[PDB]
């Protein structure tokens, strides 16, 4: 337990290079020098901003996010504490899977997506078998690590437009919940990193959802696909399906890729 959480030391990694920025912080690709060793390891760093307080939820909540054990879900792997917090994991070298989708929307075929679909959900899967609610499933939080192997990231941690009825009106946050940002997540994939509810502000969303309005169906969905997608959006969270339900439909679904998405030159 303890153990699967490195406290590293300043010596023992380098920023090399700004992989982005934004409000949360800066990450970067680096190198991890564990002290001892003789291998100098490719990883990412996240630098959060100086929190004002305490820090010992902090590091309470990064010996959870070390202790996951699932290829689909992204493990932390080590904390360096100073006056900022310093995290540091595995590089995902392809990004994240909403660009990727985005920038070779053209070359993806549907054994990729089904593929990708049986991946996320048996990531959500493990985090609610270990009862982690994720709370901002979207395609920005899948990493790529490799073109067929994905990875959940940022769980635990407003996303209105990913964000189940029940979760704006009345900030209620289950595993059905996320099912309900599964279902956006399978959405913005099946349309190539569309925005969902493009232009519509977020303040009318939950009006929009109220009136029975949902996200349409993406042109190369079968219906039984999108079918699944509008499960996962039932105002009544136990009528959703579970995720290992999905599991298993979208496995069977990958076993016939081109039965169940219709794709130009597939
Ligand atoms: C879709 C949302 C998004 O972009 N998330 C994001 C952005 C920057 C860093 C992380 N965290 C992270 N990143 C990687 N790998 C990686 C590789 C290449 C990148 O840039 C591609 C375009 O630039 C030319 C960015 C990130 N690995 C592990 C991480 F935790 C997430
Ligand atoms: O570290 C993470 N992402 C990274 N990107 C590049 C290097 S680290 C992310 C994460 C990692 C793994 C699983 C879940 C969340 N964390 C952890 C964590 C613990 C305490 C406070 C904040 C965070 C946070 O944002
Ligand atoms: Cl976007």
Same mark, same amino acid.
């Given at each position: 337990?303890?153990?699967? $959480?490195?406290?590293?030391?300043?010596?023992?990694?380098?920023?090399?290079?700004?992989? *982005?920025?934004?409000?949360?912080?800066?990450?970067?690709?680096?190198?991890?020098?564990?002290?001892?060793?003789?291998?100098?390891?490719?990883?990412?760093?996240?630098?959060?901003?100086?929190?004002?307080?305490?820090?010992?939820?902090?590091?309470?909540?990064?010996?959870?996010?070390?202790?996951?054990?699932?290829?689909? !879900?992204?493990?932390?792997?080590?904390?360096?504490?100073?006056?900022?917090? =310093?995290?540091?994991?595995?590089?995902?070298?392809?990004?994240?899977?909403?660009?990727?989708?985005?920038?070779?929307?053209?070359?993806? *075929?549907?054994?990729?997506?089904?593929?990708?679909?049986?991946?996320?959900?048996? *990531?959500?899967?493990?985090?609610? /078998?270990?009862?982690?609610?994720?709370?901002?499933?979207?395609?920005?939080?899948? $990493?790529?690590?490799?073109?067929?192997? !994905?990875?959940?990231?940022?769980?635990?941690?407003?996303?209105?437009?990913?964000?189940?009825?029940?979760?704006?009106?009345?900030?209620?946050?289950?595993?059905?919940?996320?099912?309900?940002?599964?279902?956006?997540?399978?959405?913005? $994939?099946?349309?190539?990193?569309?925005?969902?509810?493009?232009?519509?502000?977020?303040?009318?969303?939950?009006?929009?959802?109220?009136?029975?309005?949902?996200?349409?169906?993406?042109?190369?969905?079968?219906? /039984? !696909?999108?079918?699944? %997608?509008?499960?996962?959006?039932?105002?009544?969270?136990?009528?959703?399906?579970?995720?290992?339900?999905?599991?298993?439909?979208?496995?069977? %679904?990958?076993?016939?890729?081109?039965?169940?998405?219709?794709? =130009?030159?597939?």
């Amino acid at each position: 337990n303890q153990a699967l $959480l490195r406290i590293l030391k300043e010596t023992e990694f380098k920023k090399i290079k700004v992989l *982005g920025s934004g409000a949360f912080g800066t990450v970067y690709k680096g190198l991890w020098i564990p002290e001892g060793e003789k291998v100098k390891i490719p990883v990412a760093i996240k630098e959060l901003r100086e929190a004002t307080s305490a820090n010992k939820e902090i590091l309470d909540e990064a010996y959870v996010m070390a202790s996951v054990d699932n290829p689909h !879900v992204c493990r932390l792997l080590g904390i360096c504490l100073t006056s900022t917090v =310093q995290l540091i994991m595995q590089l995902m070298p392809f990004g994240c899977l909403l660009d990727y989708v985005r920038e070779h929307k053209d070359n993806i *075929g549907s054994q990729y997506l089904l593929n990708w679909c049986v991946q996320i959900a048996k *990531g959500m899967n493990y985090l609610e /078998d270990r009862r982690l609610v994720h709370r901002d499933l979207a395609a920005r939080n899948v $990493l790529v690590k490799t073109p067929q192997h !994905v990875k959940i990231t940022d769980f635990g941690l407003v996303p209105i437009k990913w964000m189940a009825l029940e979760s704006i009106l009345h900030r209620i946050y289950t595993h059905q919940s996320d099912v309900w940002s599964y279902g956006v997540t399978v959405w913005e $994939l099946m349309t190539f990193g569309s925005k969902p509810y493009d232009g519509i502000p977020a303040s009318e969303i939950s009006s929009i959802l109220e009136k029975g309005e949902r996200l349409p169906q993406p042109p190369i969905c079968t219906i /039984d !696909v999108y079918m699944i %997608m509008r499960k996962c959006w039932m105002i009544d969270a136990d009528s959703r399906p579970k995720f290992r339900e999905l599991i298993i439909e979208f496995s069977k %679904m990958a076993r016939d890729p081109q039965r169940y998405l219709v794709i =130009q030159g597939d």
